[PDB]
Design a protein around this ligand. Structure first.
Ligand SMILES: [Mg+2]
Lengths: 48, 48, 53, 94, 226, 52, 228
């Protein structure tokens, strides 16, 4: 089976920051740069 | 900018590119429910 | 100097002032000296419990 | 929170007596098919279904709403256990 | 399989509050519709407001009138709450005259009647007088949209006139909500709820119609390139 | 597809108990009214995370 | 008067993939009021065409490799998701493109057999590398729709061994709008709105813009007949 990312899957970076996907937003809902580029992941600053 | 309202976030945000790994722990392999099923030999309690 | 909290938060909508700016607002008969953010918080609690007093 | 939970907790001296009253009343409603309810037709709980609004099937919801009305009597040593069931059967045959 | 047209329901109480529900909507269209309408309701609906007041024997807005409990600031704050509706589209600006003798309690109904002008709230409290108190006023009511501070327009009729913040918008407050709805196996649908508070001069439904019209009129601007 | 409509009726009014181990105090078990959702993960209210 | 007149529209286009649409002068705050609703509609609700099913001869599933072909089926299908097909017929709903190649060659999107009223917008797209003795005979099904439909949802298989492909029908690639400070007469708070639209070429930015305006315009007619 080819598994795509879904709500409840666990993501992490190399610096010990880990969490579960809790929301998958449509592209038009994500914050974007003034040039029109949406971001891919939103991380809480309270974890640092 | 906010994708829903179109207005800017009131403060500048730390936007960047980060390397994120998808870990082996997936909710697909962990969701489980039961109503009735196998029972133990001696105690007759549900199996685990 | 705002006549009521709705007028103060209407000015916030138009960008006249920020929620953190200290202004004068007339709330419950008292001429308070607070920010629209604190008047907004008071309205938040009043509506959840449905008792302004 | 359950609707009127504050009022329900104030009708009994012990919070665990309210659970006994509601749980026992719910069984009376289930056993007689909700025909013994003290709720008026305009007060019956309803559930939104695709076809339309029908009576709520949850008897614990019915018991809690009935208790708030004040048309139920509860206590200890009200009537004999055997006699209560016999009388209820006659009034609401099932 | 395009989604069916949503059902628009209105739950209006009086002439100052109302709730409007539009459902079901395609995913994300509650925000697509609620945000543009909310911005128009709070900034573009035409209205009237007091933009200037003249009080005899009053020099500056931070003074105090002898014989009246309220100071100049408090009287001005009361005027900001006045709701006036022009009954003649040609009429653009009017002046309201108020003369009172103590120790009466001045109300909005004490204003001298003016043709084609209706005071929506005549029971509004303006000032309180005592024996020997005098209140001569000349309030100038204009037509406009949005919120305009006194320092911005700076409207003065005669010398010693006091500019007042012009609350032109008849809509007091707008709050829209989006909830998840489902139509069978479609679960990402949207339900839009729009709550509008008004001063009573225009009903919330009237305001909503004007906001929808204003957005529609602007969409016709994408018509003739160059 | 009618099974899911019937399920929405079965759970109406009912509650379920959510349990997280270790159950240090009694607030480690709490009753909630389920909202049937698409997916495979349980959604937990933010305000009950400290108790759990 | 305070009633601002009709703005002047301005269109600047670079081929079929970029377009700038300027609308000025506007009232204060209408740049965001008009720009954002259009941007949300453009990014989600604009119909397009996508590959929904691919059949490769002698291949049973997508977890296999084709003898003589450098890429596996998973990689080939990923390349096919980048194919841009423009239907010249408004009534056309589906088309099957046939590719028949033999090694040694690099099969591009220009190797598909021609179809009537169908044009490939990126003929240089790389599909597969064929080594000597390798053959690639596949049928690609291109549908028309809106949004993002995963292959698990539509499950389209023209035949037994066809492989459903996740469909991203949206033709718009990126949308951005800029609000500048323009002044008209004695009013200096006015707005100038600039929509920047990037498309894949199947739908020109102007066509996508017009559809977005119509979608918003039709949604505004749902506030007409209250049910109360
Ligand atoms: Mg595409």
């Amino acid at each position: 089976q080819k598994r795509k990312l879904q709500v409840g899957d666990k993501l992490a970076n190399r610096h010990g920051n880990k969490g579960v996907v809790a929301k998958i937003l449509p592209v038009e809902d994500m914050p974007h740069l003034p040039d029109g580029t949406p971001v891919d992941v939103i991380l809480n600053p309270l974890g640092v | 900018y906010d994708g829903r309202t179109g207005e800017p976030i009131e403060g500048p945000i730390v936007v960047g590119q980060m390397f994120i790994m998808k870990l082996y722990h997936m909710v697909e392999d962990k969701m489980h429910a039961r109503s009735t099923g196998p029972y133990s030999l001696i105690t007759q309690q549900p199996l685990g | 100097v705002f006549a009521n909290p709705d007028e103060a938060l209407l000015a916030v909508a138009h960008g006249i002032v920020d929620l953190q700016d200290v202004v004068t607002v007339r709330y419950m008969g008292k001429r308070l000296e607070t920010s629209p953010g604190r008047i907004l918080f008071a309205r938040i609690v009043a509506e959840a419990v449905e008792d302004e007093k | 929170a359950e609707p009127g939970i504050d009022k329900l907790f104030g009708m009994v001296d012990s919070k665990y007596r309210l659970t006994v009253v509601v749980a026992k009343r719910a069984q009376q409603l289930l056993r007689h098919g909700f025909k013994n309810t003290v709720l008026e037709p305009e007060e019956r709980p309803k559930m939104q279904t695709l076809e339309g609004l029908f009576d709520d099937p949850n008897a614990v919801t019915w018991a809690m709403k009935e208790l708030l009305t004040g048309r139920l009597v509860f206590g200890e040593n009200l009537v004999p256990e055997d006699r209560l069931q016999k009388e209820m059967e006659r009034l609401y045959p099932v | 399989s395009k989604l069916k047209a949503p059902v628009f329901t209105v739950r209006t109480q009086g002439r100052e509050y109302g709730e409007f529900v539009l459902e079901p909507l395609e995913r994300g269209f509650g925000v697509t519709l609620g945000n543009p309408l909310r911005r128009i309701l709070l900034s573009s609906i035409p209205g009237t407001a007091v933009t200037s007041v003249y009080i005899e024997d009053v020099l500056h807005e931070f003074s105090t009138i002898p014989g009246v409990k309220e100071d100049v600031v408090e009287i001005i704050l009361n005027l900001k709450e006045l709701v006036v509706r022009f009954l003649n589209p040609s009429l653009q600006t009017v002046t309201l005259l108020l003369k009172a003798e103590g120790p009466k309690e001045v109300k909005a109904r004490d204003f001298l009647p003016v043709a084609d002008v209706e005071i929506m709230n005549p029971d509004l409290h303006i000032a309180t007088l005592e024996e020997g108190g005098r209140l001569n006023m000349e309030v100038r009511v204009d037509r406009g949209v949005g919120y305009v501070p006194a320092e911005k327009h700076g409207i003065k009729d005669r010398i010693n006139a006091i500019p007042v913040d012009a609350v032109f918008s008849p809509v007091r407050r707008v709050a829209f909500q989006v909830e998840d709805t489902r139509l069978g196996q479609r679960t990402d649908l949207d339900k839009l709820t729009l709550r509008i508070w008004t001063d009573g001069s225009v009903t919330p439904l009237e305001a909503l119609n004007q906001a929808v019209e204003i957005l529609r009129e602007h969409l016709t601007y994408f018509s003739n390139p160059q | 597809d009618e099974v899911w409509d019937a399920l929405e009726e079965v759970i109406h009014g009912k509650v379920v108990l959510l349990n997280r181990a270790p159950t240090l105090h009694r607030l480690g078990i709490q009753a909630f009214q389920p909202v049937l959702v698409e997916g495979q993960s349980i959604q937990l209210h933010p305000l009950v995370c400290e108790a759990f």
